[PDB]
Symmetry: C2
């Protein structure tokens, strides 16, 4: 009952879909073995790459496939197109810059090859190495102009550092030059923040992912990234990492902080936080196949700014697709949500 | 829109997360800041509120300190009939000298009891405790229920980086169930172990860090099985549930995924889903969130009987917020629950 081809009145374009390369997963394993992995890596990838559980082993196998098996899984859930990115944390944790750039290059060329082979099914977002912002800028050039990619995905922090630092500016300069979106995907929190979450089993997707990612998007908003770069669009998954829900409180407390001069890095902005959510931020529902949360986001940010995502293979659930197809929404809204918003914002 | 006391609009306005301070305890914070024993959160939060020359800070400190006619006037001016009062975060929880903590918490509780006696139709008390000493805290829970007329207690999230899911804190929960009173988990700044990236961006306080710390704490309690151990226990949180109601689908999906894959020895099977515990054991206020779409979303998730009005005076003392809440496109029956009768039930007023 879930079919490709758009007969139900829209294509299903899934906008937060993951893959891995074996050589990068082997680096994570090396890091865990040699003690250079951070606590988040040990937690996340010591689980996914090593647990014998059904969940981990299926995720690992699915991540590594970029062909007929992934296509079969998409066919079986009626997914027309998938926007693919290297799974978190990509090469961001790597201490050897030459190794990070090499592996990122390879992962990008691997993705490009797959998209060339399945051009009606797979759409690519590039991976970068923000450890090297200037290289990353050139890799943004290459993905947009040579590889056919539609943007980049950054897996939140790089070695405990956030994108609001001036150090990272070449990434933003390059994105606005090629006029492509940035997708800030979660990662585990850095060692400076993870301990109370990790000790309770909360460091991953259940909680810590949202803390890390929402903090990252928020600190970019509050540093004025969209005043510096008014064309820039930043996408986040998981229903906006709670930011839409907190909006009233964000704006109230932002304004209080600005006016009171409480903080060096919180100065006046040209728009409210609400205003940036309406003009510069875009949200997917990855992991949140939940009609009230989706409708809430659509109401707060505008229906044109909210997109369907599956989060394959971390959350591959046919009944979720069925629930999304069944939502109490107009045909027109549902087509935006499943298809045409993604067509617009990713320039498909 | 006139804001009047007396319920002529169809309900009393019962404000359920309202703060006060004591000069002696603020002086301790200043001492800890000066001597270097204050954590980064204390330096940030109380360095600001107790020392900032900012207009917001100065007026907030004066209002915090008043437990009399000024506070009453401020309530009258915004049509607030009753305020549920608690010692402002982080209370005595950061203190290293337990004699001092116990003495100052006793004093603060005595002061609050005295004020509530003076204005018994306007002020309702929640006790403060010192979780560093869970035995003393248990006695203080009983003292507040027996002698002081209090309706429960407020704990200001973590105590020196230690969380209530730890077995050490069990005597506090045992005492709450014995007196049959709720726990309000109010925010605090994050501990030094988690605060640094937030603090650097100006995000450690009410804008963001408070919700992270508090949502985390409540999620840790849910997932340790506090409500299987204590099925009668009610835990209240402000700020529209510290995002948990909005995350709920993701919370349950990933909690179940973790348990079934045996990922964390800490995370064991629970008798209810997280959704089940929200509907049976957690209560939410809208402190700081005078925003209809979020209130209505939370009502749908939790049930309209489980969501209450709060002002968060004096940190967020805004007449126009009251006006907006009075004017929500919501039935008279639901509005009366939200402002009045839910609080009357859950606080046993
Ligand atoms: Mn994902
Ligand atoms: Mn408060």
């Amino acid at each position: 009952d879930l079919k490709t081809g758009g007969e139900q009145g829209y294509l299903r374009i899934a906008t937060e879909e993951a893959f891995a390369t074996r050589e990068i997963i082997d680096v994570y394993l090396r890091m865990i073995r040699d003690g250079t992995a951070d606590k988040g890596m040990v937690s996340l990838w010591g689980f996914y790459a090593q647990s014998p559980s059904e969940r981990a082993t299926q995720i690992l196998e699915r991540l590594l496939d970029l062909g007929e098996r992934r296509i079969a899984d998409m066919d079986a859930t009626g997914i027309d197109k998938a926007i693919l990115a290297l799974t978190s944390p990509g090469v961001q944790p790597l201490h050897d810059l030459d190794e990070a750039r090499t592996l990122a290059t390879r992962a990008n060329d691997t993705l490009a090859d797959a998209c060339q082979k399945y051009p009606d099914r797979f759409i690519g977002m590039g991976t970068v190495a923000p450890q090297d912002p200037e290289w990353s800028a050139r890799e943004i050039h290459r993905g947009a102009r040579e590889l056919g990619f539609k943007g980049i995905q950054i897996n939140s922090h790089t070695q405990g550092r956030y994108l609001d630092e001036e150090f990272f500016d070449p990434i933003f300069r390059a994105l606005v030059e090629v006029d492509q979106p940035l997708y800030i995907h979660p990662a585990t929190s850095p060692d400076s923040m993870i301990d109370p979450m990790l000790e309770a089993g909360l460091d991953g997707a259940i909680f810590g992912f949202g803390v890390e990612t929402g903090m990252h998007l928020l600190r970019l908003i509050t540093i004025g990234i969209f005043d510096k770069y008014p064309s820039l669009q930043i996408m986040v998954g998981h229903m906006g990492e709670a930011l839409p829900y907190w909006l009233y409180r964000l704006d109230y407390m932002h304004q209080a902080g600005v006016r009171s001069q409480r903080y060096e890095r919180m100065k006046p902005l040209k728009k409210t936080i609400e205003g940036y959510l309406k003009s510069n931020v875009l949200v997917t529902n990855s992991g949140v196949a939940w009609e009230p949360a989706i409708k809430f986001c659509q109401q707060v940010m505008g229906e044109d700014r909210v997109m369907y995502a599956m989060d394959y293979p971390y959350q591959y659930v046919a009944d979720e697709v069925r629930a999304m197809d069944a939502m109490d929404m107009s045909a027109q809204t549902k087509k935006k949500f499943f298809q045409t918003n993604a067509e617009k914002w990713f320039k498909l």
